[PDB]
C-alpha cells in the first residue's frame, strides 16, 4: 500500500504510457479525460512552499477553464490560479491543464491536477 499516486504520474503510467511534460497534448484532452476522472477521490498535496495540510477532495469532474485562464479577486487584483501558486513560489509546469473541479458542486474549487493525487483505494 501507501500508493498515493500523483495524478500526473497516474496519467503517465496508466492513461498515456508516455511522458507528461511541456509536450502535453492532454491539455485540451482534459475534457475527454473528465469521463475517467469523474467520481474519484484525490489527495490534494499543497506544494512544499505552502506548508499546508493535504486534504482529499471528491472529484466531480473538471472545470471548463485552465489555471492560466481563471482569475479570482485577491488584494483587489484578479490573479490567475497559476499566478497565485507561482507567487507562493511554485511554478506550475502545465497550468494550461483544465483545473480540477472539486470541493463541492455548489462550491467548486479549481485546483491544478498536477498537485492532486489519486488515492490507492479508489482504484
Instruction: Give the Cα separation of 106 and 61 in Å (integer).
Output: 13
Q: What is the CATH number of the domain that holds 92?
A: 2.170.260.10
The experimental technique behind this entry is NMR
Contact call for residues 120 and 60 (beta carbons, < 8 A):
no
Helix (H, G, I), strand (E, B) or coil at 108: strand
Instruction: Give the Cα separation of 57 and 54 in Å (integer).
Output: 10
State how many domains the chain has: 1
Q: Which residue segment(s) compose the domain that 39 sits in?
A: 1-123
Contact call for residues 110 and 99 (beta carbons, < 8 A):
yes
DSSP string, 38-106: TTEEEEE---TTT----EEEEE-EEEEEETTT-EEEETTEEEEHHHHHHHTT---S-TTSEEEEEE-SS
Look up residue 15 and give its three cell numbers.
Answer: 492513461
Amino acid at each position: 500500500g501507501a500508493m498515493a499516486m500523483p495524478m500526473i504520474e497516474y496519467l503517465e503510467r496508466f492513461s498515456l504510457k508516455a511522458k507528461i511534460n511541456n509536450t502535453t497534448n492532454l491539455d485540451y484532452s482534459r475534457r475527454f479525460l473528465e469521463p475517467f476522472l469523474r467520481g474519484i477521490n484525490v489527495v490534494y498535496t499543497p506544494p512544499q512552499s505552502f506548508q499546508s495540510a493535504p486534504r482529499v477532495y471528491r472529484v466531480n469532474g473538471l472545470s471548463r477553464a485552465p489555471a492560466s485562464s481563471e482569475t479570482f479577486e485577491h488584494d483587489g487584483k484578479k490573479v490567475t490560479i497559476a499566478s497565485y501558486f507561482h507567487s507562493r513560489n511554485y511554478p506550475l509546469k502545465f497550468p494550461q491543464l483544465h483545473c480540477l473541479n472539486v470541493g463541492s458542486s455548489i462550491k467548486s474549487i479549481l485546483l491544478p491536477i498536477e498537485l492532486c493525487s489519486i488515492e490507492e483505494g479508489q482504484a
